[PDB]
Amino acid sequence: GTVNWSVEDIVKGINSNNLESQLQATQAARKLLSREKQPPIDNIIRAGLIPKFVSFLGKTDCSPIQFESAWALTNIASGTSEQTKAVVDGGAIPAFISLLASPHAHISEQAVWALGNIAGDGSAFRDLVIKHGAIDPLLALLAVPDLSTLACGYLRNLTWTLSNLCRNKNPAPPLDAVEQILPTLVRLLHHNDPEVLADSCWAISYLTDGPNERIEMVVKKGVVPQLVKLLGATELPIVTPALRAIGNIVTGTDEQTQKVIDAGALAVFPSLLTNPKTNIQKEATWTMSNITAGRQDQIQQVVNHGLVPFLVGVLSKADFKTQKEAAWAITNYTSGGTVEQIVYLVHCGIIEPLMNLLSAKDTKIIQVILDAISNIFQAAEKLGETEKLSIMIEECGGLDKIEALQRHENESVYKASLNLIEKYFS
């Protein structure tokens, strides 16, 4: 029937003055466009079919051609930016928004999907979709007493599309749009479907990826406890964005960071910092590094939750990028910590693995580690214990590495090392 049509035959059917011939040809186009191997998107665009598809979106008396055209355009918009632009340039945005209110659930859903692809292209198209008034009708589709009454695929698509309206920066989405969307997002974040939860977490991770003011908008909605709960989920597609969101939040103020701690986030970290998925371990360690950049009472919570041994662990053995985040966690800890907290660090065995990493080629991690060592020595100075530390560092081959770093070509490195040598190793 409509399987494997040539583009010329599709054009012929669409240019016929016959609505049923146009429907068949549009369906043929939809099938070409939904084939996994190189759908001929550019050939379809070149044939000038987008404006025709867009006009078909308005055919209220022929819902089948609305659906087929909506599907065809969705798949063109799913392509490159240039391909998405062709769809927008054809006037698709207002046409799809009008379709959100369709009495046909499958058509409304397709329009949600298409708008998701358009918004997903970038900040400009996202903002243009918002300007055409998409948010109101989208939110209206979710204005039900219990989300569980909605078709699963339908809910997932709405969640995903809303996440794209939250996505991207330079600029971030309009403050008013974010305020408008958040209460619905908070609701979706409490739903029970893993895909809805994952995409709700993605949206929250985008919204918290910015200045403290953007973080505050989210934190004020009280979602942190739910994020921490999702941090403990078994589904990796949920934990990944949940953890990015939590990590973003702790890049904010000390107070915003405290809400994460208050919600019990630290108790999940023994598992996160030993997680078999490398990226989870890395993001969790990054997150830890920002928490140890906090107040002394927050560093103390890290101590109380027994997380210093886990940091020693990651520093001792982990993917290198993870070890780098650990190094940062330690330097931040030593920067803001009390003498007793810093001493505890040494007692947990931080020195040897810290020394071992000085063989790294990465210039920045070397600077970070040397800073930590300087900080630790400072604490020791205030206890008259520099000698015993000097010996510790020498016993594990640390002094050898620091001595060599005087020959390091980077200025700040061969400076910092010289300073340590001439001040504690004479």
């Binding site: 799913s78 397709q110 997903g120 292209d121 990826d209 990944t240 964005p241 904010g252 590094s289 950049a293």
Partner: peptide, 21 residues
């Protein structure tokens, strides 16, 4: 003297989706 650091890498869900059926 500890400064907070934003993520080094972009992390996001799928920006666009093709409908297969």
């Amino acid at each position: 003297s500890a400064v907070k650091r934003p993520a080094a890498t972009k992390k996001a869900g799928q920006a666009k989706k093709k409908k297969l059926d």
